[PDB]
Amino acid sequence: SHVDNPFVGASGYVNPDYSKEVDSSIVKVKDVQLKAKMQVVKSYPTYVWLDSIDAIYGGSRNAGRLSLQGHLNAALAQKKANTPITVGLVIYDMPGRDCHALASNGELPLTQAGLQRYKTEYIDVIASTLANPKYKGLRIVNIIEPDSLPNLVTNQSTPACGQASSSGIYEAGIKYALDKLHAIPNVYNYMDIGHSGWLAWRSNMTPAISLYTRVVQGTAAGLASADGFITNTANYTPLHEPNLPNPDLTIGGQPISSSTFYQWNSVFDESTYAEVLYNAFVGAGWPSKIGFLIDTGRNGWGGSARPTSASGNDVNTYVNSGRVDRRLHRGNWCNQSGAGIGMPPTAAPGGHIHAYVWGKGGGESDGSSKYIPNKQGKGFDRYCDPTYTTPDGTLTGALPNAPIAGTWFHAHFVQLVTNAYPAI
């Protein structure tokens, strides 16, 4: 029943809510070739974010979206005979969610009372829904709480993150999620582990690896509770930086890793990141068969200005000429301009990569560019404000006139399709 890599030989569930979002853009554009590229984009599986208790129930409780059961019912109707199918879910309601965000939309407080709600009203309801014999023929693939554990390693100076650590609540929430979800034999769990590479940098690697190891080892099944890891969830870092294959290359006596853009971080892309983590986890005693997912929904960095080479007599000129990631700063995560769709969802593309997945479907907003009245409790994170100067000293790169988090952003969508790499 429980196979090593649930993506092998399997189709994927195509979410009709994402299709309906895409359709809303198709009818606005008169370019029939662009319409066609959008038809193709909505043919790909996209992950379903359970970003609140309300998201489990759908309907009027969640902006008209399908309930969890509605998703699982639709998945049944898409399953081909004698062919497995994966249903992608994002488990995303940690107490004190997004401790490093300027404005988190997480509903649950970072308290023991918050944790008990997480257990009873969120995880337990999801787990009992997934355990229904009606759905035994589906393979459920979970992205486990993005934007949670890595902050305990890199952002402990932020008070909310220091408290997520010292309270034990993040670790308690992950353990409970893994215990209840791994107990269902057709459920596969992939631990979110960020994207930047800062988790692997210098004195961060040991606490990062030991943190993930300690949390999963303490579950009932130990390391078997996690089938693997996922990087780049909802972010933009490219699969490869093809013009900068060697971070140690020196120009003017300095390695290009020391350019402004990388700030001494030798991990330039998600392929390098996943391999660095894989080797470290195997070094910590994880089984060699662990797999990595990479979210490639918005990390293509294509279009007609994508660099094809690198040149320059100093590391900054060189790196900036050649990097396909065109962001002002690798810390800019919201509604990024210039970004394009990346690799389509792809099973077992090579090595220890179990799959390329569209963790976040391109076109949905990362947050509004102002505070917009809404009934979902979605706020205004200045990292979504195009005019905001971040603590890193650059603007955000976010697209202007953005709607609230998790709702459709037509202008970003058109841009993402136009700039797809590979092209649609």
Side-chain angles (χ1 to χ4, degrees), residues 181-239:
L181 296 167
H182 178 63
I184 312 166
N186 55 322
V187 170
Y188 299 76
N189 297 316
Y190 289 83
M191 295 294 297
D192 182 87
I193 194 163
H195 75 94
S196 68
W198 286 119
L199 273 188
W201 194 78
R202 298 192 71 93
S203 69
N204 291 333
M205 175 68 104
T206 288
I209 300 307
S210 90
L211 172 61
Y212 281 80
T213 300
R214 175 174 70 252
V215 169
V216 187
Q217 180 178 358
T219 64
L223 302 192
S225 302
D227 296 284
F229 301 88
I230 177 172
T231 78
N232 217 37
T233 301
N235 213 285
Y236 303 87
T237 299
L239 192 55

Short mmCIF file of all heavy atoms in Angstrom, two decimals, residues 181-239:
data_model
loop_
_atom_site.label_atom_id
_atom_site.label_comp_id
_atom_site.label_asym_id
_atom_site.label_seq_id
_atom_site.Cartn_x
_atom_site.Cartn_y
_atom_site.Cartn_z
N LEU A 181 -1.57 12.01 10.71
CA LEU A 181 -1.65 11.87 9.26
C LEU A 181 -0.88 10.64 8.78
O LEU A 181 -1.35 9.93 7.89
CB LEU A 181 -1.15 13.15 8.60
CG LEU A 181 -2.02 14.37 8.90
CD1 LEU A 181 -1.31 15.65 8.49
CD2 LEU A 181 -3.36 14.28 8.20
N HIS A 182 0.29 10.37 9.37
CA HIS A 182 1.02 9.16 8.99
C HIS A 182 0.26 7.89 9.33
O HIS A 182 0.49 6.86 8.69
CB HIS A 182 2.40 9.12 9.65
CG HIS A 182 3.19 7.88 9.32
ND1 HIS A 182 3.59 7.58 8.04
CD2 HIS A 182 3.60 6.85 10.10
CE1 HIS A 182 4.24 6.43 8.04
NE2 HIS A 182 4.26 5.97 9.28
N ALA A 183 -0.65 7.93 10.30
CA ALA A 183 -1.40 6.74 10.68
C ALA A 183 -2.30 6.24 9.56
O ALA A 183 -2.73 5.08 9.58
CB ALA A 183 -2.25 7.05 11.92
N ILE A 184 -2.62 7.08 8.58
CA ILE A 184 -3.46 6.69 7.45
C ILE A 184 -2.53 6.20 6.34
O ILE A 184 -1.66 6.97 5.88
CB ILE A 184 -4.31 7.87 6.98
CG1 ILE A 184 -4.98 8.51 8.21
CG2 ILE A 184 -5.37 7.42 5.99
CD1 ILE A 184 -5.58 9.86 7.96
N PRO A 185 -2.65 4.93 5.91
CA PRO A 185 -1.56 4.33 5.11
C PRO A 185 -1.43 4.89 3.71
O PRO A 185 -0.36 4.75 3.10
CB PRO A 185 -1.94 2.83 5.08
CG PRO A 185 -3.43 2.82 5.30
CD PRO A 185 -3.72 3.98 6.21
N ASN A 186 -2.48 5.51 3.16
CA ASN A 186 -2.38 6.12 1.84
C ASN A 186 -2.10 7.63 1.92
O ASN A 186 -2.35 8.36 0.95
CB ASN A 186 -3.65 5.84 1.03
CG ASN A 186 -4.90 6.28 1.74
OD1 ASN A 186 -5.02 6.15 2.96
ND2 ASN A 186 -5.86 6.80 0.99
N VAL A 187 -1.59 8.10 3.06
CA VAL A 187 -1.22 9.50 3.24
C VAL A 187 0.30 9.60 3.28
O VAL A 187 0.97 8.83 3.99
CB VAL A 187 -1.85 10.08 4.51
CG1 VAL A 187 -1.28 11.45 4.83
CG2 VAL A 187 -3.39 10.16 4.35
N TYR A 188 0.85 10.55 2.52
CA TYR A 188 2.29 10.76 2.41
C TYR A 188 2.61 12.17 2.90
O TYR A 188 1.92 13.12 2.53
CB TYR A 188 2.75 10.58 0.95
CG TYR A 188 2.47 9.17 0.45
CD1 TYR A 188 1.18 8.78 0.10
CD2 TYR A 188 3.48 8.22 0.37
CE1 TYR A 188 0.90 7.50 -0.32
CE2 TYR A 188 3.21 6.92 -0.07
CZ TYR A 188 1.92 6.58 -0.41
OH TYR A 188 1.65 5.30 -0.84
N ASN A 189 3.63 12.29 3.75
CA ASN A 189 3.93 13.55 4.42
C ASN A 189 5.30 14.05 4.02
O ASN A 189 6.30 13.35 4.23
CB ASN A 189 3.87 13.40 5.94
CG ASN A 189 2.49 13.03 6.43
OD1 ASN A 189 1.48 13.59 6.00
ND2 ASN A 189 2.44 12.07 7.36
N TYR A 190 5.36 15.27 3.49
CA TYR A 190 6.62 15.93 3.14
C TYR A 190 6.79 17.18 3.99
O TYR A 190 5.96 18.10 3.94
CB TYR A 190 6.66 16.26 1.65
CG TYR A 190 6.81 15.01 0.79
CD1 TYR A 190 5.69 14.25 0.45
CD2 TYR A 190 8.06 14.60 0.32
CE1 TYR A 190 5.81 13.12 -0.33
CE2 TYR A 190 8.19 13.46 -0.47
CZ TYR A 190 7.06 12.73 -0.79
OH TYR A 190 7.16 11.61 -1.58
N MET A 191 7.88 17.22 4.76
CA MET A 191 8.18 18.32 5.66
C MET A 191 8.65 19.54 4.86
O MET A 191 9.63 19.47 4.11
CB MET A 191 9.27 17.89 6.64
CG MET A 191 8.88 16.79 7.60
SD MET A 191 7.61 17.33 8.73
CE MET A 191 8.46 18.63 9.61
N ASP A 192 7.98 20.68 5.04
CA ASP A 192 8.44 21.92 4.43
C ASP A 192 9.76 22.33 5.07
O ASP A 192 9.90 22.31 6.29
CB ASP A 192 7.42 23.04 4.62
CG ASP A 192 7.87 24.33 3.94
OD1 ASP A 192 7.57 24.49 2.74
OD2 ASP A 192 8.54 25.16 4.60
N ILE A 193 10.73 22.72 4.25
CA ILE A 193 12.02 23.11 4.82
C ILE A 193 12.57 24.34 4.10
O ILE A 193 13.76 24.41 3.76
CB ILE A 193 12.99 21.89 4.83
CG1 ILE A 193 14.21 22.13 5.73
CG2 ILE A 193 13.38 21.43 3.42
CD1 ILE A 193 14.93 20.84 6.08
N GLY A 194 11.70 25.33 3.87
CA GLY A 194 12.13 26.62 3.37
C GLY A 194 12.70 26.56 1.96
O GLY A 194 12.37 25.67 1.17
N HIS A 195 13.58 27.52 1.64
CA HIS A 195 14.02 27.67 0.26
C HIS A 195 15.34 28.41 0.06
O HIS A 195 15.99 28.24 -0.97
CB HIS A 195 12.96 28.43 -0.53
CG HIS A 195 12.96 29.90 -0.23
ND1 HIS A 195 13.67 30.81 -0.99
CD2 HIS A 195 12.41 30.60 0.79
CE1 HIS A 195 13.51 32.02 -0.47
NE2 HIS A 195 12.76 31.92 0.61
N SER A 196 15.70 29.28 1.00
CA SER A 196 16.76 30.25 0.74
C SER A 196 18.14 29.61 0.74
O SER A 196 19.07 30.13 0.10
CB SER A 196 16.73 31.35 1.79
OG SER A 196 17.10 30.80 3.04
N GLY A 197 18.31 28.52 1.47
CA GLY A 197 19.62 28.00 1.77
C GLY A 197 20.22 28.49 3.07
O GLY A 197 21.26 27.98 3.47
N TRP A 198 19.60 29.48 3.73
CA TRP A 198 20.18 29.98 4.98
C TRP A 198 20.12 28.95 6.10
O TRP A 198 20.93 29.01 7.04
CB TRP A 198 19.49 31.27 5.42
CG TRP A 198 19.85 32.49 4.59
CD1 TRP A 198 18.99 33.25 3.85
CD2 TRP A 198 21.15 33.08 4.45
NE1 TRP A 198 19.68 34.28 3.25
CE2 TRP A 198 21.00 34.20 3.60
CE3 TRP A 198 22.42 32.78 4.95
CZ2 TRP A 198 22.08 35.02 3.24
CZ3 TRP A 198 23.51 33.60 4.59
CH2 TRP A 198 23.32 34.70 3.75
N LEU A 199 19.18 28.00 6.01
CA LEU A 199 19.13 26.89 6.96
C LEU A 199 20.40 26.05 6.93
O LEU A 199 20.75 25.42 7.94
CB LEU A 199 17.94 25.99 6.66
CG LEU A 199 16.61 26.36 7.28
CD1 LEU A 199 15.63 25.20 7.01
CD2 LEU A 199 16.83 26.58 8.77
N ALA A 200 21.08 25.99 5.78
CA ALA A 200 22.27 25.17 5.61
C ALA A 200 23.57 25.94 5.87
O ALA A 200 24.66 25.36 5.78
CB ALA A 200 22.28 24.56 4.20
N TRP A 201 23.48 27.22 6.20
CA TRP A 201 24.63 28.10 6.22
C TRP A 201 25.33 28.06 7.58
O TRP A 201 24.70 28.30 8.61
CB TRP A 201 24.18 29.52 5.89
CG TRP A 201 25.26 30.49 5.55
CD1 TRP A 201 25.93 30.60 4.36
CD2 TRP A 201 25.76 31.52 6.40
NE1 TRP A 201 26.83 31.64 4.43
CE2 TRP A 201 26.75 32.22 5.68
CE3 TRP A 201 25.49 31.91 7.72
CZ2 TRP A 201 27.46 33.29 6.22
CZ3 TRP A 201 26.20 32.98 8.25
CH2 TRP A 201 27.16 33.65 7.50
N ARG A 202 26.63 27.77 7.55
CA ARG A 202 27.50 27.79 8.72
C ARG A 202 26.88 27.13 9.94
O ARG A 202 26.58 25.93 9.92
CB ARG A 202 27.91 29.23 9.04
CG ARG A 202 28.69 29.88 7.90
CD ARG A 202 29.32 31.17 8.36
NE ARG A 202 30.41 30.90 9.28
CZ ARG A 202 31.68 30.77 8.90
NH1 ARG A 202 32.01 30.92 7.62
NH2 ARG A 202 32.61 30.50 9.81
N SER A 203 26.69 27.89 11.02
CA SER A 203 26.25 27.28 12.27
C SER A 203 24.75 27.00 12.30
O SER A 203 24.23 26.58 13.34
CB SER A 203 26.63 28.16 13.46
OG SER A 203 25.88 29.35 13.46
N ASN A 204 24.05 27.24 11.18
CA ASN A 204 22.62 26.95 11.12
C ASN A 204 22.35 25.49 10.76
O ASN A 204 21.29 24.96 11.11
CB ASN A 204 21.93 27.85 10.09
CG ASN A 204 21.87 29.31 10.53
OD1 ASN A 204 21.88 29.62 11.72
ND2 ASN A 204 21.81 30.21 9.55
N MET A 205 23.28 24.83 10.07
CA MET A 205 22.98 23.51 9.53
C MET A 205 22.72 22.50 10.65
O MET A 205 21.70 21.80 10.65
CB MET A 205 24.12 23.06 8.62
CG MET A 205 23.98 21.63 8.07
SD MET A 205 22.61 21.46 6.89
CE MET A 205 23.51 21.40 5.34
N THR A 206 23.62 22.42 11.64
CA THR A 206 23.44 21.46 12.72
C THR A 206 22.12 21.64 13.47
O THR A 206 21.38 20.65 13.62
CB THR A 206 24.64 21.51 13.68
OG1 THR A 206 25.77 20.91 13.03
CG2 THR A 206 24.32 20.78 14.98
N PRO A 207 21.75 22.84 13.96
CA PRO A 207 20.43 22.95 14.61
C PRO A 207 19.28 22.68 13.65
O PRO A 207 18.26 22.14 14.08
CB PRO A 207 20.41 24.39 15.16
CG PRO A 207 21.44 25.13 14.36
CD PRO A 207 22.50 24.11 14.01
N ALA A 208 19.41 23.02 12.37
CA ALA A 208 18.33 22.75 11.42
C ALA A 208 18.12 21.26 11.26
O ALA A 208 17.02 20.74 11.49
CB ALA A 208 18.64 23.39 10.07
N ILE A 209 19.17 20.54 10.88
CA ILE A 209 19.08 19.09 10.75
C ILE A 209 18.64 18.46 12.06
O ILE A 209 17.73 17.64 12.09
CB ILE A 209 20.42 18.52 10.26
CG1 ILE A 209 20.79 19.09 8.89
CG2 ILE A 209 20.37 17.00 10.25
CD1 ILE A 209 19.73 18.96 7.82
N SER A 210 19.27 18.84 13.18
CA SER A 210 18.90 18.22 14.45
C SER A 210 17.47 18.56 14.86
O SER A 210 16.80 17.74 15.50
CB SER A 210 19.88 18.61 15.55
OG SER A 210 19.46 19.78 16.21
N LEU A 211 16.98 19.75 14.50
CA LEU A 211 15.60 20.11 14.78
C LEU A 211 14.63 19.19 14.04
O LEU A 211 13.76 18.58 14.65
CB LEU A 211 15.32 21.56 14.40
CG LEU A 211 13.86 22.02 14.45
CD1 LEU A 211 13.31 21.89 15.85
CD2 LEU A 211 13.74 23.46 13.94
N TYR A 212 14.77 19.09 12.71
CA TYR A 212 13.89 18.21 11.96
C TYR A 212 14.04 16.77 12.43
O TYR A 212 13.05 16.04 12.55
CB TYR A 212 14.16 18.33 10.46
CG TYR A 212 13.52 19.56 9.85
CD1 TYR A 212 14.11 20.82 9.97
CD2 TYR A 212 12.31 19.47 9.19
CE1 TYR A 212 13.50 21.95 9.42
CE2 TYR A 212 11.70 20.59 8.64
CZ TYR A 212 12.29 21.82 8.75
OH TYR A 212 11.65 22.90 8.19
N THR A 213 15.26 16.35 12.72
CA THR A 213 15.45 14.97 13.17
C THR A 213 14.76 14.74 14.51
O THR A 213 14.02 13.77 14.68
CB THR A 213 16.94 14.64 13.25
OG1 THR A 213 17.52 14.80 11.95
CG2 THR A 213 17.14 13.21 13.71
N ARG A 214 14.97 15.65 15.46
CA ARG A 214 14.38 15.52 16.79
C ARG A 214 12.85 15.50 16.72
O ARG A 214 12.20 14.71 17.42
CB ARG A 214 14.86 16.65 17.68
CG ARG A 214 14.23 16.70 19.04
CD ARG A 214 14.90 17.78 19.88
NE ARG A 214 14.62 19.14 19.43
CZ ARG A 214 15.49 19.93 18.82
NH1 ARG A 214 16.72 19.50 18.58
NH2 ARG A 214 15.14 21.16 18.47
N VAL A 215 12.26 16.35 15.88
CA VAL A 215 10.80 16.42 15.83
C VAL A 215 10.21 15.14 15.26
O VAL A 215 9.29 14.55 15.83
CB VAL A 215 10.34 17.65 15.02
CG1 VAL A 215 8.82 17.56 14.76
CG2 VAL A 215 10.68 18.92 15.77
N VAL A 216 10.71 14.70 14.10
CA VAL A 216 10.12 13.52 13.48
C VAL A 216 10.49 12.25 14.25
O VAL A 216 9.67 11.33 14.36
CB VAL A 216 10.53 13.41 12.00
CG1 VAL A 216 9.77 12.28 11.32
CG2 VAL A 216 10.28 14.73 11.28
N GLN A 217 11.69 12.20 14.82
CA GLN A 217 12.08 11.02 15.59
C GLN A 217 11.15 10.81 16.78
O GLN A 217 10.85 9.67 17.15
CB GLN A 217 13.53 11.12 16.05
CG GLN A 217 13.99 9.91 16.87
CD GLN A 217 15.45 9.98 17.30
OE1 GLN A 217 16.18 10.92 16.95
NE2 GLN A 217 15.89 8.97 18.06
N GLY A 218 10.65 11.90 17.37
CA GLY A 218 9.77 11.77 18.51
C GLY A 218 8.36 11.33 18.19
O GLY A 218 7.60 11.06 19.12
N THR A 219 7.98 11.29 16.91
CA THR A 219 6.65 10.80 16.56
C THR A 219 6.57 9.30 16.87
O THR A 219 7.57 8.65 17.15
CB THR A 219 6.35 11.06 15.08
OG1 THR A 219 7.25 10.32 14.26
CG2 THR A 219 6.48 12.55 14.75
N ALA A 220 5.35 8.76 16.82
CA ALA A 220 5.18 7.35 17.17
C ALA A 220 6.00 6.44 16.26
O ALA A 220 6.69 5.53 16.73
CB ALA A 220 3.70 6.98 17.12
N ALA A 221 5.97 6.69 14.95
CA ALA A 221 6.70 5.87 13.99
C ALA A 221 8.13 6.34 13.76
O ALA A 221 8.83 5.76 12.93
CB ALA A 221 5.95 5.82 12.66
N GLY A 222 8.59 7.37 14.47
CA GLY A 222 9.94 7.85 14.22
C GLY A 222 10.06 8.46 12.83
O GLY A 222 9.10 9.02 12.28
N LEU A 223 11.26 8.34 12.25
CA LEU A 223 11.53 8.93 10.94
C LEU A 223 10.58 8.44 9.85
O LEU A 223 10.51 9.08 8.79
CB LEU A 223 12.97 8.65 10.53
CG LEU A 223 14.05 9.15 11.51
CD1 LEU A 223 15.43 9.07 10.84
CD2 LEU A 223 13.74 10.55 12.01
N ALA A 224 9.87 7.33 10.06
CA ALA A 224 8.96 6.86 9.03
C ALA A 224 7.73 7.75 8.89
O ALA A 224 6.97 7.57 7.93
CB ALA A 224 8.51 5.42 9.31
N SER A 225 7.51 8.70 9.81
CA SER A 225 6.34 9.56 9.75
C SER A 225 6.43 10.59 8.63
O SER A 225 5.42 11.19 8.28
CB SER A 225 6.14 10.29 11.09
OG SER A 225 6.00 9.38 12.17
N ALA A 226 7.64 10.82 8.11
CA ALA A 226 7.87 11.79 7.04
C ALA A 226 8.45 11.05 5.85
O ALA A 226 9.49 10.40 5.95
CB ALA A 226 8.83 12.91 7.49
N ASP A 227 7.76 11.13 4.72
CA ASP A 227 8.24 10.48 3.51
C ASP A 227 9.34 11.27 2.84
O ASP A 227 10.10 10.71 2.04
CB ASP A 227 7.06 10.26 2.58
CG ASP A 227 6.04 9.32 3.18
OD1 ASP A 227 6.31 8.10 3.18
OD2 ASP A 227 5.00 9.78 3.69
N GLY A 228 9.46 12.56 3.17
CA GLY A 228 10.52 13.37 2.61
C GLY A 228 10.34 14.83 3.00
O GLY A 228 9.69 15.14 4.01
N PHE A 229 10.92 15.70 2.19
CA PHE A 229 10.96 17.13 2.43
C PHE A 229 10.52 17.86 1.18
O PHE A 229 10.56 17.31 0.08
CB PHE A 229 12.37 17.57 2.82
CG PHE A 229 12.89 16.88 4.05
CD1 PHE A 229 13.56 15.68 3.97
CD2 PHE A 229 12.72 17.46 5.30
CE1 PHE A 229 14.05 15.05 5.10
CE2 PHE A 229 13.19 16.84 6.43
CZ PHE A 229 13.87 15.63 6.33
N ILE A 230 10.09 19.12 1.33
CA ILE A 230 9.78 19.97 0.18
C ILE A 230 10.43 21.33 0.37
O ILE A 230 10.36 21.92 1.45
CB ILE A 230 8.26 20.12 -0.06
CG1 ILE A 230 8.01 21.08 -1.23
CG2 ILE A 230 7.51 20.59 1.19
CD1 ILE A 230 6.56 21.16 -1.69
N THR A 231 11.04 21.85 -0.70
CA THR A 231 11.61 23.19 -0.73
C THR A 231 10.83 24.08 -1.70
O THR A 231 10.09 23.60 -2.57
CB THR A 231 13.09 23.15 -1.14
OG1 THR A 231 13.19 22.98 -2.56
CG2 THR A 231 13.83 22.02 -0.41
N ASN A 232 10.99 25.39 -1.53
CA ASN A 232 10.49 26.43 -2.43
C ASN A 232 8.98 26.63 -2.36
O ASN A 232 8.44 27.35 -3.22
CB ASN A 232 10.88 26.19 -3.89
CG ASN A 232 11.21 27.48 -4.63
OD1 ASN A 232 11.80 28.40 -4.05
ND2 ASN A 232 10.86 27.55 -5.92
N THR A 233 8.30 26.06 -1.36
CA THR A 233 6.85 26.19 -1.26
C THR A 233 6.45 27.65 -1.29
O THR A 233 6.88 28.44 -0.45
CB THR A 233 6.34 25.54 0.03
OG1 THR A 233 6.70 24.15 0.06
CG2 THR A 233 4.82 25.65 0.08
N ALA A 234 5.65 28.01 -2.29
CA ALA A 234 5.13 29.36 -2.47
C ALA A 234 6.24 30.39 -2.71
O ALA A 234 5.97 31.60 -2.63
CB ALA A 234 4.27 29.78 -1.27
N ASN A 235 7.47 29.96 -2.98
CA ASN A 235 8.51 30.94 -3.28
C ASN A 235 8.91 30.85 -4.76
O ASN A 235 8.27 30.17 -5.57
CB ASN A 235 9.73 30.78 -2.36
CG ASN A 235 10.41 32.13 -2.07
OD1 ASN A 235 11.12 32.69 -2.93
ND2 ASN A 235 10.20 32.66 -0.86
N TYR A 236 10.02 31.52 -5.09
CA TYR A 236 10.38 31.81 -6.48
C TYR A 236 11.80 31.40 -6.87
O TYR A 236 12.23 31.71 -7.99
CB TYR A 236 10.22 33.31 -6.74
CG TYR A 236 8.83 33.88 -6.46
CD1 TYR A 236 8.47 34.34 -5.19
CD2 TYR A 236 7.89 33.98 -7.49
CE1 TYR A 236 7.20 34.90 -4.96
CE2 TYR A 236 6.63 34.52 -7.27
CZ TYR A 236 6.28 34.98 -6.01
OH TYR A 236 5.01 35.51 -5.82
N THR A 237 12.55 30.77 -5.98
CA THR A 237 13.97 30.54 -6.26
C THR A 237 14.10 29.54 -7.40
O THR A 237 13.42 28.51 -7.39
CB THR A 237 14.68 30.06 -5.00
OG1 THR A 237 14.58 31.07 -3.99
CG2 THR A 237 16.15 29.79 -5.29
N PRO A 238 14.93 29.81 -8.40
CA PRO A 238 14.93 28.96 -9.59
C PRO A 238 15.39 27.54 -9.31
O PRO A 238 16.10 27.25 -8.35
CB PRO A 238 15.88 29.68 -10.55
CG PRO A 238 16.66 30.64 -9.73
CD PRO A 238 15.79 31.00 -8.55
N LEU A 239 14.91 26.63 -10.17
CA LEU A 239 15.37 25.24 -10.15
C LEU A 239 16.87 25.17 -10.37
O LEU A 239 17.60 24.48 -9.64
CB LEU A 239 14.62 24.45 -11.22
CG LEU A 239 14.72 22.93 -11.21
CD1 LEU A 239 14.31 22.39 -9.85
CD2 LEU A 239 13.85 22.34 -12.33
#
